[PDB]
């Protein structure tokens, strides 16, 4: 299928100017208006630029767009953490009796300083245990950058294949990430061990942090 090619990502420090390219063909960008859409995490695409360079009211003037030949470009001046989002270009394509083409999309990341996580650990509740399963949850709060090593030790034995991680999108106010790691055990396996520990190694830490508990305390 037809598509307009955008870089997968783009970044800048706050206040800098990020530009996103969008290349297509003579039958779409070369013939028709280009639109741009901003998608903040958890929300629908919102109109950002229409007709190559028109700004809807309510869109700050630091957003500008341009079209040249079969290429288009978005420029975000004065980058702010609120601009962390996915950006799509789009244009109508006259080929094959006409069809609407969207760009592949660009995630904009605001670069900031390294920040270590705050680590919390949550034992399983008794309400959950009473139905046969134990989830142990390790929380990493507000850290940068996104890469992090999060491991589980049960009575000092490294765990594998029984945990799942989830990571938030970049925060719109402080540009950090949060992460949960969840270890799952049957009640019977949970009950045969004593010490539960998640260890976190991260670029903001000089050495790994451990949070742990003893089953029943």
């Amino acid at each position: 299928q037809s598509v307009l090619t955008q870089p997968p990502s783009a970044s800048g420090t706050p206040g800098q100017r990020v530009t996103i390219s969008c290349s297509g063909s003579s039958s779409n960008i070369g013939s028709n208006f280009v639109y741009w859409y901003q998608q903040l995490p958890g929300t629908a695409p919102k109109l950002l630029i229409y007709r190559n360079n028109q700004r809807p009211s309510g869109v700050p003037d630091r957003f500008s767009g341009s079209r040249s030949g079969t290429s288009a470009s978005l420029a975000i001046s004065g980058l702010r953490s609120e601009d962390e989002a996915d950006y799509y270009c789009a244009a109508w394509d006259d080929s094959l009796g006409g069809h609407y083409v969207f760009g592949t999309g660009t995630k904009v990341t605001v670069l900031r300083t390294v920040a270590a996580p705050s680590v919390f650990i949550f034992p399983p509740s008794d309400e959950q245990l009473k139905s046969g399963t134990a989830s142990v949850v390790c929380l990493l709060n507000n850290f940068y950058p996104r890469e992090a090593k999060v491991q589980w030790k049960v009575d000092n034995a490294l765990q594998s294949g029984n945990s799942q991680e989830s990571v938030t999108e970049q925060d719109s106010k402080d540009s950090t990430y949060s992460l949960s790691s969840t270890l799952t055990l049957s009640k019977a396996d949970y009950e045969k061990h004593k010490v539960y520990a998640c260890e976190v190694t991260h670029q903001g830490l000089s050495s790994p942090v451990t949070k742990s508990f003893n089953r029943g305390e």
Partner: protein, 218 residues
């Protein structure tokens, strides 16, 4: 102010049918072409269908032609999308969109979008969640929302009175085929004996709403 609310999403078995609707207000609905756009979770955007102000002009993307039927009711400010013979790859947020131009006939310019309704095409059956507490200078607490299907769940705290410090994590699919997620919040330790913490869990596909009080344990 323009408003667009899609509904009709949820899970549906492959091969079967599902009809989506969009409610519109805040503009003269009968003057504008309307559009459906979809986005499979974590992916890009794909135009689905368009219908002009008087339904005299209708267009479909090749990926849905012959299976989907778009329609509208100007008297009820409503746009519709009947989807038949659904396949897994039709799984997506379906968005309703209002054109920027009045009385156009061709193409499509997307001015306003509804927040979308999620369509999950799956063999799995719908299942409500269980809600467990993640019990507590700073303290963390939260709720664990486990073993539901399909997406989405939404989570608020103290009915929207508590937003600062909240992280509701993207759901993950467990090896069991059910989803799970956590919502947590960091709060002052000084508040734990005085301030009440309730997470409000909403799973529309199963008509489940849960207010879970999360207290320090004994």
């Amino acid at each position: 102010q323009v408003q667009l609310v899609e509904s009709g999403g949820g899970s549906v078995q492959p091969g079967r049918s599902l009809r989506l609707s969009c409610e519109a207000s805040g503009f003269t609905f009968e003057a504008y072409a309307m559009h459906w756009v979809r986005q499979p979770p974590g992916k890009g955007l794909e135009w689905v269908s368009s219908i002009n102000w008087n339904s005299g002009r209708i267009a479909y993307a090749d990926s849905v032609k012959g299976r989907f039927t778009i329609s509208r009711d100007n008297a009820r400010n409503s746009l519709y999308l009947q989807m038949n013979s659904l396949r897994l790859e039709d799984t997506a947020f379906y968005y309703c969109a209002k054109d920027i131009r009045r009385f156009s006939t061709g193409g499509a310019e997307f001015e306003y979008w509804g927040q979308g309704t999620l369509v999950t095409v799956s063999s799995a059956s719908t299942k409500g969640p269980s809600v467990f507490p993640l019990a507590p200078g700073t303290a963390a607490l939260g709720c664990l929302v486990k073993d539901y299907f399909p997406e989405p769940v939404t989570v608020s705290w103290n009915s929207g009175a508590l937003t600062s410090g909240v992280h509701t994590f993207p759901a993950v699919l467990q090896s069991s085929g059910l989803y799970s997620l956590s919502s947590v919040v960091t709060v002052p330790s000084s508040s734990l004996g005085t301030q009440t913490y309730i997470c409000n869990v909403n799973h529309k596909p199963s008509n489940t709403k849960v207010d879970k009080r999360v207290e320090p344990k004994s």
